Design a protein around this nucleic acid. Sequence first.
RNA 1: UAUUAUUUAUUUUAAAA
Lengths: 221, 259, 232, 224, 267, 181, 340, 215
Amino acid sequence: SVQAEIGILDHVDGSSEFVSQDTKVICSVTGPIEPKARQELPTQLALEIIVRPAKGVATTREKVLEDKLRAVLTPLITRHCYPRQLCQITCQILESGEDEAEFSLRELSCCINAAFLALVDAGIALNSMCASIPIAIIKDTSDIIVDPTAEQLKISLSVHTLALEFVNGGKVVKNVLLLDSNGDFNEDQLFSLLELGEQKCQELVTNIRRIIQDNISPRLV
Amino acid sequence: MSLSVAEKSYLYDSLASTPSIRPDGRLPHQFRPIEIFTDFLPSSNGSSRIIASDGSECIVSIKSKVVDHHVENELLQVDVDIAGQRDDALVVETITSLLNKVLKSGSGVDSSKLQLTKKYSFKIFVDVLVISSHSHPVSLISFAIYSALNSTYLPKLISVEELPTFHDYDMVKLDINPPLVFILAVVGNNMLLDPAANESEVANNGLIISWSNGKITSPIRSVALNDSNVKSFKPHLLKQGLAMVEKYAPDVVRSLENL
Amino acid sequence: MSTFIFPGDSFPVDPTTPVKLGPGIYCDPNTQEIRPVNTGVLHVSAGVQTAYIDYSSKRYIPSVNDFVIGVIIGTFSDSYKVSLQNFSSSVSLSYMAFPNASKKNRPTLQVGDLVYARVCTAEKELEAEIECFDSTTGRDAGFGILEDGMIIDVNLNFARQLLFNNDFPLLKVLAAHTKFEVAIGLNGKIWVKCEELSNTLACYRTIMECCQKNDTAAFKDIAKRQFKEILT
Amino acid sequence: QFPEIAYPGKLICPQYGTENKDGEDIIFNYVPGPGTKLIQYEHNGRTLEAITATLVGTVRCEEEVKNILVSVLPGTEKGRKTNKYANNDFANNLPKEGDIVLTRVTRLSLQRANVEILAVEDATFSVSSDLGETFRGIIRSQDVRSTDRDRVKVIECFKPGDIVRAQVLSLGDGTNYYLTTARNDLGVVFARAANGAGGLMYATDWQMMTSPVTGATEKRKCAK
Amino acid sequence: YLLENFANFKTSKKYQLADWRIRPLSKPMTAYARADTHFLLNIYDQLRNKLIESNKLAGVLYESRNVAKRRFEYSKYRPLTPSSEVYSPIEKESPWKILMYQYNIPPEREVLVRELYQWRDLIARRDDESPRFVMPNQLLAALVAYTPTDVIGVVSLTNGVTEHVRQNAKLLANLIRDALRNIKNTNADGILLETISVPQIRDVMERFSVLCNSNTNSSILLGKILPREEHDIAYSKDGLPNKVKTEDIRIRAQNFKSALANLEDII
Amino acid sequence: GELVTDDPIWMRGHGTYFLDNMTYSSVAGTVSRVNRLLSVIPLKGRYAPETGDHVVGRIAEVGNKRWKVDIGGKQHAVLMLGSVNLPGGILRRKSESDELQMRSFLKEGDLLNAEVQSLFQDGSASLHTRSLKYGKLRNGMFCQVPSSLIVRAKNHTHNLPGNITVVLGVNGYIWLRKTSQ
Amino acid sequence: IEIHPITFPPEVLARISPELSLQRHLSLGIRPCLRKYEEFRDVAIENNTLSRYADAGNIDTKNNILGSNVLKSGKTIVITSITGGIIEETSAAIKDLDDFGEEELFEVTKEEDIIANYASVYPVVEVERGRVGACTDEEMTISQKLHDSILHSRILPKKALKVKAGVRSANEDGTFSVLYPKMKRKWSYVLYAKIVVLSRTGPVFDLCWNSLMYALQSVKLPRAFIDETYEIICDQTKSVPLMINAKNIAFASNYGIVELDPECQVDIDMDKLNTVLIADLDTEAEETSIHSTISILAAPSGNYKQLTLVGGGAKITPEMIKRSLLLSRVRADDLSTRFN
Amino acid sequence: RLLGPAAAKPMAFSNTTTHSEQELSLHTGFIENCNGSALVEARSLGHQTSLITAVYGPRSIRGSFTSQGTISIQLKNGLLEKYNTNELKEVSSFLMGIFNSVVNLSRYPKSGIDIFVYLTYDKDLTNNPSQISSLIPHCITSITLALADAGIELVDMAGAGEANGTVVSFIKNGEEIVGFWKDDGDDEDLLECLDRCKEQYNRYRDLMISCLMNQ
RNA sequence: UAUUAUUUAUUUUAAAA
């Protein structure tokens, strides 16, 4: 079970807050707004992805976290219907929920889920839906576990971040947005967790669809 | 100010003539009037302020530190700070790298005159503050570090190896031969000494020459004075400029060591 | 027929019947399929059958034939520079877009002035243009400078419900307490003004509180409690 | 008699040269060209106005007591056919007045269309990433068409990302060039539907462009 | 601006270019005329107090005296130097020069716009009319661009001619025809060869010939790793690499360029 | 900060500000009284341009339909395009913009002389070169003196012995050149 | 109806539209790099070329590099050297308290931390692209990826970077003599790497990793000793090679998934889905157009260390995932044995 | 990560633990990013030098109205024998004063030329203990090669040589000097310095044309 | 061509009829 809220921040177009285990990420989206000269795109929408750590300043660790979060949201946004415009997606990691010096998958997974919900609250044209879960395998008993705790990461052989794309009521997996894997694994373990992850993300969007509908429906008429 | 291309060609033809028609009309070996103040920073071991004719001003401060020369390489460090420029600017790092070569410990400055025990010696910190500058100030700064090093007082040493101790009131005078740097501007076939602002803008090339112990010493450079009219020079001009400073440098040292 | 929809879902309209594209649905220039891109309630009207999605949004996108409240941020030789919303792209307001305009006469509008205009050009690849008199119908009543008063920030759905739907009881519950004059802009701006400032202040606090409380039946108790508080 | 290959610094010939041919003495007038410069040299105390090559390639002479256009083209004759100097040729060959270029619309204003020059004539052309070498021009609304120049709509003639074949007019304001498309062979030569989000459209009428697969039509200022 | 703000007088401002010669004035024009000075005294009281608080009263009174000191003078007797204290209906030595740039007129037709601008001015003085009444600049540009030869061409122009042009069609046609026939009426190397001549070229060439009589390691550390050319490989089914030859990619290059430009018909 | 007078019947000038029906000074200088104009003349001050000044200025930049000339005041003076003697009389358009065509004969850094035609509200000077007397300076050398040390006279430029001509600009800019025709 | 297009030479084609020039080449089964679908680039390396221990006989005195590698794949050039330092570690263990109660409480409450027993290198990437300024986003992302992959792949265990501390003596007129083996003070080796990428034509992370894996297999740890205020000193010539387990070493290779369009070489062929797979991406045309790539770190024995799967462009099917993994093995098996 | 642990110290090697001809190799044209490339290598006595030079130009500067071009030379450390950043920029300003007198600047209006020199390897094999003077002649020859490969007009070739810290760059077969650099050294000596550098200049002046005319 | 102009505007005299 995961917790999520929508429309929490005032001075932005769309905000969200995603919680999983102990990882908490607050994300905000503002767009379309006037882009900078070094940002504008002649035909499509420009994105400004910013993730900030819970402790210390933004290091190069969050730079690759931006680049991965960017690769997920870019195909998820209908950029072409916002020419010469800007969208500011800012993720604030409140609690890491994991050892920052060793792992960064539980924060990447939450930033994806927080950014998607914030993009829904903002009103940006999205081509589809998205879900992200962290996956790990334990050393002694090579068992695949979904959404592992912080202690299970320190006893894992490999860690995985699976980001999927859902269409048509959240049942058809259109594509695999991101599958980031690090550790020790072979071809048999990949498709074993990939098949296991496709049904855990499938119930995440089913729960995410319920979360955003419980909030947007009272707003509209 | 800047110069128009009309008056640029007017100065080039008048300076490159066999009778060098200087703007102010001085001789190719005459300098401009200079004002030099000394001994005004009590917190520093030595200090000096120099004011050029074109409003250029430079302030030098000299601090000291007891350091072990067996582990401290350079005993003389120069830290330049030009007003209105960043500390990582090219115009600052070049002069900083050049002034640490004219004042290198063991080269232009003999490390023996600032030594203490067999283990310890003094490290001189020469800090430069250029308030105003119109041309290349490497020659104006060299005059300021000259008058400051010739008025610097370091604490007197009181003397099994133990840490050194110094007297409470009495201090010794720093007697070091401070090198001097001159700027030469070649305009066609004429060699000019101490070029002005507008003079250094039409010059074909420039020359930097050091002077210590009553003779020409390292380092010497041939950096340009303006990227517009950069012209290669005949080696006889290099010899003429290198020999012209030998003829008038003692006149400077005599007029500069009076304090 | 109204149902909640999500991006990427199947569009519940057969491709046989021609359907008009509205705000919310998107026609892929490649696959030519009609798919949603926003999240909200889907609306389909049973001559012409149009379809659109009502999604929650606060960042205004310029669209033609829209009444907006803009702020003048720049005076120039032949046009003003107007901002419809902070951080957004500015729009153009020509000097000839006024009643009784003249090339030899500059309008008496300065920066910081609120104008009630109509969007007459909303090209995606160009700067949007506004005008203080309808170039199609010749209207001019209600357009122009909004002197004094107070402007309020609301979401786009609250502003559209207040201008179009006559059943929205906010205007009615406000008239029961004080006489005022209101100007509603589709860019999320609401300009109110009363005789006394105390009445305008209570109108500001009510519209602010009614925008966040989506319970339409609570608007009567909001204005009742708000106007009763300023009397202290 | 000059060596074919030349290096920057090789003395070619002075500005004056004579020879006796058929009992009629002629004097050659050698003027500097693209790849040379008059350099004074001293060997006995007297100067001379000699021509010195300053490029890496072959020397070529042309004509306009006649004058001789002494120039040095960069590269070898075998390298020019392979076109191994495509990046160097783009920067060294600046777009002069009256040239034809292939640009890309990047910004649409109500009265102009900012473009980015990508090629230029040398049909052969010349085109160069992190190279940092690119030119840009402006196609004003008055230079879009010849029929009814004033009072046009550039939104119906160009779109951001379209490739435009336009002839230059003159250096606009130093920052930008001034181009024109008031010809039947000048205009959009390669565009895509919905600002590149659709299919490859093809020109049909003088102001109509359509894609075969999608079948969607969009108005442009085509060239055919 | 002073009425709508300091006087709170909202007014439509269109009775400026109207014909004020008509009598009696209409009720809107009488109300507009009185409004230009009715509130100007109250505005004067407000602006004066603000100039005292801002210490700008001295500059306004100084500029006001310079406005009252303006002197009207005929254009023929105007000063040659531009001054802000003297006024003339024409303040330029050649007023037709700014018309040739405004309407893009070739400089060869300046003799035409000169004789037409001067003729238009003398006609305006005779009938006490404005130069634009007898011939606007829009029609003046058409006469110099189209150059109507026959008398019919002077009358039939796209914009339409004025009555002065209609009556003087024969005179104007005789002027453009005469000015155009006056346009058709209007429409080295031995300097340096004598200084050096020919026999003295053998000296500068002999100077050349004997002035310029004064004119391989494979690698050390990185010379045999960096200048290496491209080598492309392909893994077979057994996992072994197979280097393709530089002639195989040559076949691919000439096969693409030849098959690229070979498209001249699409169904 | 100090009080100069408490008489409300005065016209405040430079170095002077009004406050509470009383008059105070904003600079440090001598009090001046001319008719009813009360002002304070500060010690050090830049050149204050006025209408009709034979000045010498240097071109800073070529702007939109004007030039920025360095006169030596608080701001750059503006030299409009329709205020100089153009080469071919008018612009030869269309081809290039107005700004690019100006750099062909009047680039940045060029030195010239002109007359202050009028003043802007902020005090900026508006120059003009509408006579043969004003033009582009050459055949000489430039020097600069303080503007206050320029004695007023009928003639701005004078002929000097030795075939030399001086151009005493009232703004402090002087141009010493050989006497021309 | 029927309208013929506009002809363009291949030079201006790649400039006006990289996506068009990409599809046109793929119609002939080729790429703009003049290579087929699954054709890679040959590599040439030179190990210990810049190292202090290049010549076993003439070991350099004033050198610092513990091991280097100069790689070149296609036209990109990668230069990777490995310097090093040493750090003194303090014993902050509860064992030194000599208390059974506190030690038992530590053993019960201590949680397992598998990756805590491994260290990593601190790389510095410098991709020369003719620009000035601070570190590019590319240089920073590559440095972080090399650090995170070296640490997770377990290349450098912490016990493999320990310092067998020595004590050099001052025997009579033998000037000095060093002896080697529990000692009090402890030390650990710290490895620094600097990478300089020249003539970049595409994604160079795979080239930086493969160049670092070669340089790591050629570094020697200089033996350290203390005199008899006494800092540690490394030996002038004697050294021990870094014991890197060849089981965990892996190599990099990037693959892309491109969907073919019918508009680039009549209505039945329009609905003909055929997504192709490209190996070792290069050139600006393939880097920008292809939005669905696969980068894999494959170790011998069919073991994979790292893999990123971005599906932005065409849909990635499990068939192409199996194909990329198998195609990753045939290159890791080559790069690991093509020189040694 | 980067930089690493702050408590770590760099390795220290002790000197008491165990104990005519100047080779040259030239190449050009091998960097696809830039226009002109160069690679010079020299190994004499116990000092080996190998550096790489790239030329990115001419680049049209937006909004610029300069009459002639602007040259930008930047030295950058490599992997061995790291010099201080102040002295590197000092040699850069000295080099820019040289090529501004050689490169045809009037042939590039409103544009600039950026030079990048990478001191990738400066080996030194002295037995037992300014060192930058031995690299200035090798850097001048590398830039002239990459400038010639980039199709940039250079008025005559430019080379230099070292004579005990004295670096002199000649032009026109040694007829005129374009640069002068001298660190440390002795006194009175000058005629032999200009002679030893001039013969070393002619050795580099023709060897650069060798690799430039082949390939 | 300042009653001229700058378009995401560097104009800093738009006032009179």
